[PDB]
Amino acid sequence: NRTPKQKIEQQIDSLLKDKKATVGVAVLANDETVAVYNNQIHFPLLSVFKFHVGLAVLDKMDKGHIALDSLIEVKSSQLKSNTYSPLRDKFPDQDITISLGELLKYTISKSDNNTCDILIEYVGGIDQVNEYVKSLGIKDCNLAATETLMHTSGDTDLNWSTPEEVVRLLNIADKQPLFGTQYKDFLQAIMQETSTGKDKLKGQLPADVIVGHKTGSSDRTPEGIKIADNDAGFVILPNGQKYYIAVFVMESQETDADNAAIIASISKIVYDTLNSD
Hints:
The protein is about 45% helix and about 20% strand.
């Protein structure tokens, strides 16, 4: 006879006992934190911060009545070849015109680094993104780097959050009228369309469960330590209710497959608990 929180907590602790990593978890449902794990730790976000960028972009667009399909010019110089960029790969060695919506899709759904940094520049810099997030009451987070800055400096600690602040942000984006409904609908959709990390939150869930999420991952050192391996998003239960989950695997000696499986196993514990309840 245990609460959903207690069951999740117990199962996570048992799963992680012998894992060589520091894992953070938060789960939020019905405007209430359901469970946490290592919630006091400041986790490097890696590409999870592209969600925060996207919110700041949608806010700016909404304020200006900017349409999702409106085309902007992107120079070849903004589509650098030294970083992961599915957009550059598709349209190499050329200037383009591309919609803000499509830039958002490449950033969130595909994790493109060039489009991320184009969108950060659109909003006026990372400090503007940081200020936006803090203006929503998110406290235990800071965003101080573009993708470029993290790549040139190596300082992946510059964008960090506790697990709970990420799920709180996801829930605010769903619940609050941050921007017009067309912008909310688009964000939810592109979140569902994410193609990276299908073996993370989604990895052990039934195939028909809808998950909208944003991945992140760091490099791994020659000594074998992977600084970060993350996934965060929403999961739609069979009654249509969402819950929000963030799993951050930091300073891990586990393999890539095993890190993803930690996330997938935590996600399945949470899903089965909330779906049974």
